[PDB]
RNA sequence: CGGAGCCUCGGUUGGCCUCGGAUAGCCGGUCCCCCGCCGGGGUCCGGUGCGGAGAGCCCUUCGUCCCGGGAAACGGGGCGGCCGGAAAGGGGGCCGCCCUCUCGCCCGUCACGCACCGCACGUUCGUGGGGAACCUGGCGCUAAACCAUUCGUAGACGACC
RNA sequence: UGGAAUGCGAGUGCCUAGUGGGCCACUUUUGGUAAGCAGAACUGGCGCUGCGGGAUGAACCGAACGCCGGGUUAAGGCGCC
């Protein structure tokens, strides 16, 4: 999977085809983190082929639809349980992200895992994302934003829009 | 029609890439006070880079070899000539259009010089990163005219301080004349305020 | 492979442009550095190599075996007639190079110095310095010369003096005198230029310039020996007798 | 990670009246004035409170390498206040086995002549920085006393003579000779 | 009694790294360095003005030494306000980095 | 020494982006370079917005960090930012730049014919002040 | 130094005549206060995405003819003395006069100017650089180098003294 | 009711040049420490082939070629060359 742009969160359900052995197979639901529904269905078949004895030709996806954030305006703390593949072995993580939505937090998770550990999106496997109150947070980079009277300046405003005034007289001010 | 560019606080290659394109595009660029050019990274890496550059010479005849220039203006000419197709006639015309000075001469001291913010040290580098002065690097590697340029620039900074004092006195005269005469020129003043020039 | 028995190299690369010298008179490449504590004086002189003889003197050095003994040593006689000062020149200090600012000659310049400015003195009409010497007996020319000296008071950093040798007293065949700049190292620029203007159109002997038991530098062109082989010039090892194409 | 805020205050005594122009600080009082320019460290200096009773140093959005740079400014300011109030009197001893090290002081604390070290006829003329005064005290045989305000200059002048009196091409574990720093204290007590 | 043409510097031809298509010319109009701002000059007429040795005829006056190669601004190029032009006769590469005149009278205002 | 601080309640001017040239309020701080951002009266919907586009100003109206748009609007109307913003020289030179951008050609001709005499009068008065200062000095 | 045509070479289509410098900090003043040969220090006061803004400043050319208002009366223009400039040096400032104006710029009346009848290289820096020759006048000018010969401090020949 | 889907006009007879030194590449694999080494299996290229890219380049990626104009991409890139 290519983590293209931002991720989306799909509630994908599926089951096996009806057989003369069992008439109605049970339904299996997952929360797939994917850009679009085609790769959501593909990654759903990947995880179902990992977990159960079920493949695409021996089964079916009953419904694949995007399910949205119930509070996109509130800023929350998502704890994501990671299972990634290193260059030497496979490892597990538990990493916190302060963000609005689940899809945005998982997008930031893919970007930051590829940042620090060079972990590719085909190696990264997400198993659980849970919204967490501010008391149960563990990471100090997330807990440092937990303040009612938070107050900080913007210390070094490195200016952009550099190549429209290419040849100017005055030196740029950067104290704001 | 001449880009008189300042050299203080400007990055070497980031300035040279901006200069060489405008030189190829038919603009007379004069980059001045090139000992104020500062190169990113600490001083010892840039010094050993230029010392490896000095060691790279022709074995059988170094007079035919690479001419390693020691002046900061000629180091800037070296990097712009590296950023030009100087084997071609348009590159030779570009090198003819380019004119680079150590210090700042009396043909160019009494001119308002330009500053490129896309190649400046405080813009493009983090403040915790180290930088190396090209003039100090050149005088340490064998350029003989740092103190002479320092005394001549001290003299012209005194002269430019006197000129800027005269300009401040003229600006005070202009503002006090406007404060006196604003009643009878309020008809000319209000029409620029409705068009957005003095608001 | 490598050289079996390592050997030091024949010759020096510090002297490798072994061409015939473009200049005949020995040019001073570096004058001594000035300081305002010392008074004004000349820092160079221009003599002529006369000959060679012995010397006999006492040796006064403690610790040696040769202490209080009568040694002989080779000496050079250099005939050094007093030179005539016929001009001055100031030097401004630029970031490109130490540039000559303004050269001011003298009024009465001798025919010995007049010989140097001509390649053929016989066919010449001897008409040099004629429009320049008219500036010394008029009102406007003295004002322009005073403005020139007053500009040299301000902007010149190094003041060199122009002196030529006195060739008529010498027993040489030639009559063309050698000219030379000598850097005056001394006090301030104003006192230096005043002393040079005082010493203008004057004789300078050798007792004013040098003294007894002074260590000095000798500049000059080597005795010419012509086109020579590598054995004669670089002093390499000769090949043995059995070589076909030369040894 | 980027820590949002780190700070540490310096409570100055009432004998001292500090001020600052930009980021360069000056400290004046009984002994003298001492300046230090902070243009390499890139922090916020708040001179808050009436009668300027404390100096605060902020660091906003800096990771561990610039968080390490916060307490060092406090330490340099406290050393400068200690140098202005009390001073720095470094006492140091001349240890020798056989040859008595002859130490004398020329130009009232500017130069130190060191003689008779391991029987060497070479003498060391070690020059202090101006501001540091070397002397020989009373009621002690082998003693050098360095007085001054700036701890940098006084301890650098101590290190100069400590590295001047060294034994070369020998076993320094057996040849325990030289002038070495013994006591690091102040000129007057408090 | 003034300038009635915008300043534009002829940079080069439509080219790859090791090929050039000299029928399409790349033009750098001064003052405009954005794709939203280069939409004004689309369709304007442009010409490289040069003077030669021999005299040529001039419409509305005496014959002079000046000559032109007329053209037409086709479409934008890049993202930094470069633009394209198709001319009837191809430009010489003597004019690399020289002034041509883009005009305003093919107007859309 | 810093004067402006990213605090819960600060009004900031947005430089670029979709809502360019608009006032907005900081409701909560999300990340190092992203903030929870709302403008009730200046028509900016509740959103996340980085600190690059917003330019923080000297206006702070008080509301809690999780307070909603009704309370932000009531604090905005109580603080009355829209009048003091137009009274500030910041927005006055912004609207001066807007008038210079929307300047017509006939308006520019009137500007030129005003500037000509307006500079001639300044030059005459500066010359009279120069000769008066010379007379007072001599 | 002070006129007309005529070849060649090209680009060009208004100038900005200047503080130093910082970036977790700048700019401009009065100076009640204090030192120096107007500068500096503290304090005070206004701005600080810069508006004592290069997101800017100056000039603006279609022209002339009459009258009235705003602006000017201390200004536009027309020959000699005195100063400032050297890193590769500025068509800068001050005193006047024997002569000419309320014309120059801003608002209004009043007409005129090949109105070349829709059609492109138009509009300047341009007395632009270089070479040929004619013009009118004034003030100034009366050369070296090389070959030849000689020397031998030099040298294959050249070159050099 | 031309007894699955899709696609394509097929079958057949003479005469016959050149070739019979090959090489490289994902995967499998023999000998060898290994080799730009020697020898194999499938398939594609070079040989026989230009073009854009890999700075350079018989084999790599893309893509195969009559002569041109407008547009658009692939592989690669978008500080300057
Ligand atoms: Mg050896
Ligand atoms: Mg033989
Ligand atoms: Mg031993
Ligand atoms: Mg023309
Ligand atoms: Mg064969
Ligand atoms: Mg075979
Ligand atoms: Mg093989
Ligand atoms: Mg084939
Ligand atoms: Mg092919
Ligand atoms: Mg390669
Ligand atoms: Mg492939
Ligand atoms: Mg095509
Ligand atoms: Mg490329």
Bridge partners, residue E99, by sequence: E9
- Angstrom CA distances, B18 to B10, B26, B35, E11, stand at 11, 13, 18, 15
Cβ–Cβ < 8 Å for F126, B174? yes
In this structure, is the CB of residue C119 within 7 Å of any atom belonging to strand G? yes
**Angle F116-F118-F121 from CA coordinates, rounded to 5°:** 110
Nucleotide nearest to E19 (CA to C1'): H52
- Report CB contact under 8 Å: F121, B189: no
Distance CA B191, CA F113 (A): 10
Strands across the sheet containing B99-100: B2-5, B28-31, B99-100
Centre of ligand 12 from the C-alpha of residue E25, in Å: 14
Specify the 3-state DSSP secondary structure of D64: helix
Chain A residues in contact with D1 (beta carbon < 8 A)? 140-141, 144
Place of tokens 């670029």: F16
| Nearest ligand to the CA atom of E24 | 12
Which phi and psi angles does A153 have, rounded to 5°? -85, 175
Specify the 3-state DSSP secondary structure of B13: helix
Would you give the end-to-end CA distance of chain B in angstroms? 31
Distance CA C74, CA B106 (A): 57
Compute the nearest-CA separation of B162 from chain C (Å): 20
DSSP D131: T
Suggest the residue from B7, B19, B117, B125 to mutate for an interface test with chain A (most A CBs closer than 10 A): B117
Looking at beta carbons, which pairs linking A49-52 to residues 24 or more positions away fall under 8 Å? A52/A28
Nearest to F83 by CA among F41, F125, F133: F41
Nearest to D119 by CA among D100, D104, D132: D100
Neighbours of B169 (CB within 10 A): 12
Distance CA D113, CA D164 (A): 11
Compute the nearest-CA separation of D73 from chain F (Å): 16
Chain A residues in contact with D4 (beta carbon < 8 A)? 144-145, 152
Q: Which ranges constitute the DSSP H helices of chain A?
A: 37-51, 102-116, 140-143
Distance CA B26, CA E27 (A): 13
Specify the 3-state DSSP secondary structure of D144: strand
- Angstrom CA distances, A100 to A73, A110, B182, F47, F48, stand at 6, 16, 56, 10, 8
- Structure tokens of A91? 């490892």
Specify the 3-state DSSP secondary structure of E94: helix
Cβ–Cβ < 8 Å for C111, C127? no
With the CA atoms of A130, A134, A138 and A141 taken in that order, what torsion angle do they form, in degrees rounded to the nearest 10?
A: 110
Bridge partners, residue E50, by sequence: E67
Centre of ligand 10 from the C-alpha of residue B85, in Å: 22
Cβ–Cβ < 8 Å for D187, D158? no
With the CA atoms of F24, F29, F31 and F34 taken in that order, what torsion angle do they form, in degrees rounded to the nearest 10?
A: 0
Nucleotide nearest to E68 (CA to C1'): G121
Specify the 3-state DSSP secondary structure of D51: helix
Which residues have beta carbons under 5 A from ligand 1 (an ion)? C 6
Positive or negative: CA dihedral C88, C94, C96, C97: positive
A173 interfacial to chain B (CB closer than 8 Å): no
Bridge partners, residue A107, by sequence: none
Would you give the end-to-end CA distance of chain C in angstroms? 24
Cβ–Cβ < 8 Å for F61, F75? yes
Looking at chain B from residue 120 to 179, which residues have their Cβ under 8 Å from any Cβ of chain E? none
Nucleotide nearest to B73 (CA to C1'): G87
Distance CA F51, CA C97 (A): 53
Name the residue in chain B with its Cα closest to that of E99. Answer: B26
Specify the 3-state DSSP secondary structure of C219: coil
Centre of ligand 6 from the C-alpha of residue C65, in Å: 94
Contacts of F40 (CB under 8 A, 6+ apart): F25, F69, F72, F73, F76
Which residues have beta carbons under 5 A from ligand 2 (an ion)? C 244
Count of B-C CB contacts under 8 Å: 11
Distance CA A48, CA B157 (A): 77
In chain C, breaks (C-N over 2.5 A) are found after none
- Structure tokens of F63? 């509301």
Cβ–Cβ < 8 Å for C174, C167? yes
Distance CA B141, CA B198 (A): 53
Half-sphere exposure of D168 (CA within 13 A, CB side): 6
Name the residue in chain D with its Cα closest to that of B126. Answer: D42
Cβ–Cβ < 8 Å for B83, B95? no
Burial of residue A166, with CB atoms counted within 10 A of its CB: 0-12 exposed, 13-18 middle, 19 or more buried: middle
Compute the nearest-CA separation of F121 from chain B (Å): 8
Distance CA D160, CA D146 (A): 12
Cβ–Cβ < 8 Å for F75, F59? no
- Angstrom CA distances, A154 to A157, A171, D68, F56, stand at 7, 20, 21, 9
CA D52 from chain centre, in angstroms, equals 25
Which phi and psi angles does C213 have, rounded to 5°? 35, 50
Between CA A99 and C1' G30 the distance (Å) reads: 54
Centre of ligand 4 from the C-alpha of residue B25, in Å: 21
Contacts of E33 (CB under 8 A, 6+ apart): A163, A164, E80, E81
Which phi and psi angles does B101 have, rounded to 5°? -125, 145
Cβ–Cβ < 8 Å for C238, C231? yes
Nearest to A173 by CA among A159, A161, A153: A159
- Structure tokens of F107? 């308006």
- Structure tokens of C153? 């008071």
Distance CA E27, CA E12 (A): 7
**Angle F101-F102-F107 from CA coordinates, rounded to 5°:** 110
D63 interfacial to chain A (CB closer than 8 Å): no
Distance CA A60, CA A15 (A): 6
Neighbours of B121 (CB within 10 A): 19
Cβ–Cβ < 8 Å for C156, C91? yes
Bridge partners, residue C183, by sequence: C160
Contacts of C19 (CB under 8 A, 6+ apart): none
Positive or negative: CA dihedral A39, A45, A46, A48: positive
Positive or negative: CA dihedral D42, D48, D54, D58: negative
Cβ–Cβ < 8 Å for F38, F24? yes
Contacts of B35 (CB under 8 A, 6+ apart): B7, B72, B102, B103, B133, B134, B135, B138, B146, B149
| Nearest ligand to the CA atom of C3 | 1
D99 interfacial to chain A (CB closer than 8 Å): no
Identify the helix (H) or strand (E) that includes residue C10: none
D152 interfacial to chain B (CB closer than 8 Å): no
Between CA F133 and C1' G78 the distance (Å) reads: 28
Looking at chain A from residue 149 to 168, which residues have their Cβ under 8 Å from any Cβ of chain B? 156, 158-159, 162-163, 165-168
Distance CA A123, CA A103 (A): 18
Distance CA B146, CA B154 (A): 12
Q: Which ranges constitute the DSSP H helices of F37-104?
A: 69-79, 81-87, 89-101
Distance CA A55, CA A37 (A): 18
CA A112 from chain centre, in angstroms, equals 10
Would you give the end-to-end CA distance of chain F in angstroms? 47
Distance CA A53, CA D128 (A): 84
Would you give the end-to-end CA distance of chain E in angstroms? 22
Compute the nearest-CA separation of B28 from chain A (Å): 13
- Report CB contact under 8 Å: B191, F121: no
Cβ–Cβ < 8 Å for D167, D178? yes
In this structure, is the CB of residue C18 within 7 Å of any atom belonging to strand G? no
With the CA atoms of C128, C129, C134 and C135 taken in that order, what torsion angle do they form, in degrees rounded to the nearest 10?
A: 160
Per-residue b/e over A80-117, b at no fewer than 16 CB within 10 Å? bebebeeeeeeeeeebbbbbbbbbbbbbbbbeebeeeb
Centre of ligand 3 from the C-alpha of residue D120, in Å: 17
Cβ–Cβ < 8 Å for D34, D45? no
Chain H positions under 7 Å from a protein CB?
51-54, 56, 69-71, 78-81
Contacts of E45 (CB under 8 A, 6+ apart): E70, E71, E72, E73, E102, E103, E105, E106
Contacts of D187 (CB under 8 A, 6+ apart): D31, D86, D87, D88, D89, D147
Cβ–Cβ < 8 Å for C189, C153? yes
Nearest to C164 by CA among C178, C182, C176, C174: C178
Distance CA B104, CA B159 (A): 13
Distance CA C12, CA D49 (A): 74
Q: 3-state SS string over C192-217?
A: HHHHHHHCCCCEECCCCCCCCCCCCC
- Angstrom CA distances, F26 to B194, F50, F83, stand at 34, 11, 19
Nearest to A128 by CA among A92, A160, A173, A172: A92
Q: Round the CA-based radius of gyration of chain D to a whole number and report it.
A: 21
Specify the 3-state DSSP secondary structure of A139: coil
Suggest the residue from E82, E97, E99 to mutate for an interface test with chain B (most B CBs closer than 10 A): E97
**Angle A46-A52-A57 from CA coordinates, rounded to 5°:** 60
Nearest to A3 by CA among A95, A119, A90: A119
Suggest the residue from E96, E98, E99, E100 to mutate for an interface test with chain B (most B CBs closer than 10 A): E96
Place of tokens 């900061």: B72
Between CA F94 and C1' G107 the distance (Å) reads: 32
- What does chain E come to in residues? 109
Name the residue in chain C with its Cα closest to that of B104. Answer: C95
F1 interfacial to chain D (CB closer than 8 Å): yes
F5 interfacial to chain D (CB closer than 8 Å): no
Centre of ligand 3 from the C-alpha of residue D158, in Å: 28
Place of tokens 């063309």: C176
Task: Find residues whose C-beta atom lies within 7 angstroms of strand H.
Answer: B 13, 16-18, 20-21, 24, 83-85; E 16-19, 21, 23-24, 74-75, 79, 84, 86
In this structure, is the CB of residue F99 within 7 Å of any atom belonging to strand G? no
- Angstrom CA distances, D111 to A105, D125, D146, D179, F78, stand at 68, 6, 12, 15, 73
Looking at chain E from residue 17 to 56, which residues have their Cβ under 8 Å from any Cβ of chain B? 28
Specify the 3-state DSSP secondary structure of B194: coil
Neighbours of C90 (CB within 10 A): 25
Distance CA D117, CA D138 (A): 22
Distance CA B45, CA B194 (A): 58
Between CA B133 and C1' H55 the distance (Å) reads: 32
Centre of ligand 13 from the C-alpha of residue E80, in Å: 18
Centre of ligand 2 from the C-alpha of residue C240, in Å: 11
To the nearest 5 percent, what fractions of chain B are helix, strand and coil? 55, 10, 35
In A51-124, which ranges are E strands?
Answer: 59-66, 76-85, 90-99
Distance CA A79, CA A94 (A): 7
Distance CA B35, CA B149 (A): 9
């Amino acid at each position: 999977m290519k983590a293209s742009g931002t991720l989306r969160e799909y509630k994908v359900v599926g089951r096996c085809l009806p057989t003369p052995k069992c008439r109605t197979p049970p339904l299996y639901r997952m929360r797939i983190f994917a850009p679009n529904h085609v790769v959501a269905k593909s990654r759903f078949w990947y995880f179902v082929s990992q977990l159960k004895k079920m493949k695409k030709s021996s089964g079916e996806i009953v419904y694949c639809g995007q399910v949205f954030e119930k509070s996109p305006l509130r800023v929350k703390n998502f704890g994501i349980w990671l299972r990634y593949d290193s260059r030497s072995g496979t490892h597990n993580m538990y990493r916190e992200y302060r963000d609005l939505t689940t899809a945005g937090a998982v997008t930031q998770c893919y970007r930051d895992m590829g940042a620090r550990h060079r972990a590719r999106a085909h190696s990264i496997q997400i198993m659980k994302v849970e919204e967490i109150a501010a008391s149960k947070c563990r990471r100090p980079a997330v807990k440092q934003f937990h303040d009612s009277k938070i107050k900080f300046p913007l210390p070094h405003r490195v200016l952009r829009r550099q190549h429209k005034p290419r040849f100017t007289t005055k030196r740029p001010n950067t104290f704001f | 029609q001449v880009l008189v560019l300042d050299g203080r606080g400007h990055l070497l290659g980031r300035l040279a890439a901006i200069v060489a394109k405008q030189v190829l595009l038919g603009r007379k660029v004069v980059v001045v006070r090139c000992e104020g050019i500062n190169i990113s990274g600490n001083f010892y890496r840039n010094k050993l880079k230029y010392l490896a550059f000095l060691r790279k010479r022709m074995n059988t005849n170094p007079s035919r070899g690479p001419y390693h220039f020691r002046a900061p203006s000629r180091i800037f000419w070296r990097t712009v000539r590296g950023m030009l197709p100087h084997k071609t006639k348009r590159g030779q015309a570009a090198l003819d259009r380019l004119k680079v000075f150590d210090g700042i001469p009396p043909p160019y001291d009494k001119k308002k010089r330009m500053v490129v913010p896309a190649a400046l040290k405080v813009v493009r580098l983090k403040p915790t990163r180290k930088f190396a002065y090209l003039g100090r690097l050149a005088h340490e590697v064998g350029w003989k005219y740092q103190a002479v340029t320092a005394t001549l620039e001290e003299k012209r900074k005194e002269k430019a301080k006197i000129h800027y004092r005269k300009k401040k006195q003229l600006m005070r005269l202009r503002k006090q004349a406007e404060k006196n005469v604003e009643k009878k020129i309020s008809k000319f003043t209000d029409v620029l305020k409705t068009h957005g020039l003095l608001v | 492979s490598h050289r079996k028995f390592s050997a030091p190299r024949h010759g020096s690369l510090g002297f490798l442009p072994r061409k015939r010298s473009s200049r005949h008179r020995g040019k001073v490449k570096s004058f001594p550095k000035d300081d305002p504590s010392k008074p004004v004086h000349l820092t160079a002189f221009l003599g002529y190599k006369a000959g060679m003889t012995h010397i006999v003197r006492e040796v006064d050095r403690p610790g040696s075996k040769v202490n209080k003994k009568e040694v002989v040593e080779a000496v050079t006689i250099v005939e050094t007639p007093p030179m005539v000062v016929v001009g001055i020149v100031g030097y401004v200090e630029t970031p490109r190079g130490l540039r000559t600012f303004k050269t001011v000659f003298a009024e009465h310049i001798s025919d010995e110095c007049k010989r140097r400015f001509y390649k053929n003195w016989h066919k010449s009409k001897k008409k040099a310095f004629t429009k320049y010497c008219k500036k010394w007996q008029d009102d406007a020319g003295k004002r322009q010369l005073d403005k020139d000296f007053s500009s040299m008071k301000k902007y010149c950093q190094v003041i060199r003096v122009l002196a030529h040798t006195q060739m008529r007293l010498l027993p040489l065949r030639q009559k063309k005198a050698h000219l030379m700049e000598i850097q005056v190292n001394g006090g301030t620029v104003a006192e230096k230029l005043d002393w040079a203007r005082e010493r203008l159109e004057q004789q300078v002997p050798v007792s004013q310039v040098f003294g007894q038991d002074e260590m000095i530098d000798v500049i000059g062109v080597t005795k010419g020996k012509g086109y020579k082989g590598v054995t004669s010039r670089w002093h390499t090892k000769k090949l043995p007798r059995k070589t076909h194409r030369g040894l | 990670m980027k820590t949002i805020l780190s700070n540490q205050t310096v409570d100055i005594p009432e004998n001292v009246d500090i001020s600052l122009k930009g980021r360069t600080v000056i400290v004046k009082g009984p002994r003298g004035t001492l300046r230090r320019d902070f243009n390499h460290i890139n922090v916020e200096l708040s001179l808050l409170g009436k009668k300027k009773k404390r100096l605060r140093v902020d660091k906003w959005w800096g990771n561990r390498k610039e968080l390490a740079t916060v307490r060092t400014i406090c330490s340099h300011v406290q050393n400068m206040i200690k140098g202005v109030t009390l001073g720095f009197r470094y006492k140091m001893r001349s240890v020798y086995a056989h040859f008595p090290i002859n130490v004398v002081i020329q130009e009232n604390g500017s130069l130190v002549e060191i003689r008779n070290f391991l029987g060497e006829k070479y003498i060391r003329r070690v020059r202090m920085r101006p501001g540091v005064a070397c002397s020989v005290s009373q009621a002690q045989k082998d003693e050098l006393v360095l007085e001054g305000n700036d701890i940098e200059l006084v301890s650098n002048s101590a290190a100069l003579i400590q590295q001047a009196t060294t034994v070369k091409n020998k076993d320094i574990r057996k040849f325990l000779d030289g002038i070495y720093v013994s006591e690091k204290g102040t000129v007057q007590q408090a | 009694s003034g300038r009635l043409w915008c300043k534009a510097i002829f940079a080069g031809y439509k080219r790859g790294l090791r090929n050039q298509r000299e029928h399409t010319a790349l033009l750098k109009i001064e003052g405009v360095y954005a794709r939203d701002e280069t939409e004004f000059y689309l369709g304007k007429r442009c010409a490289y003005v040069y003077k030669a040795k021999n005299n040529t005829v001039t419409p509305g006056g005496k014959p002079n030494k000046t000559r032109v190669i007329w053209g037409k601004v086709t479409r934008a190029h890049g993202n930094s306000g470069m633009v394209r032009a198709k001319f009837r006769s191809n430009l010489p590469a003597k004019a690399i980095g020289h002034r041509i005149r883009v005009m305003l009278y093919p107007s859309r205002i | 020494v810093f004067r402006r601080f990213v605090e819960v309640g600060r009004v900031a001017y947005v430089s670029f982006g979709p809502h360019a040239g608009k006032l907005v309020a900081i409701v909560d701080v999300i990340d190092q370079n992203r903030a929870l951002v709302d403008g009730p009266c200046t028509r900016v919907r509740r959103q996340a917005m980085p600190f690059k586009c917003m330019q923080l100003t000297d206006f702070i109206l008080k509301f809690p960090h999780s307070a909603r748009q009704k309370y932000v609007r009531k604090a905005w109307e109580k603080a009355d930012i829209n009048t003091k913003w137009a009274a500030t020289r910041w927005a006055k030179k912004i609207e001066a730049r807007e008038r210079k951008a929307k300047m017509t050609d006939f308006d520019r001709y009137k500007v030129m014919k005003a500037k000509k005499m307006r500079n001639r009068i300044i030059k005459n008065e500066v010359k009279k002040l120069q000769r008066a200062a010379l007379l007072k000095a001599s």
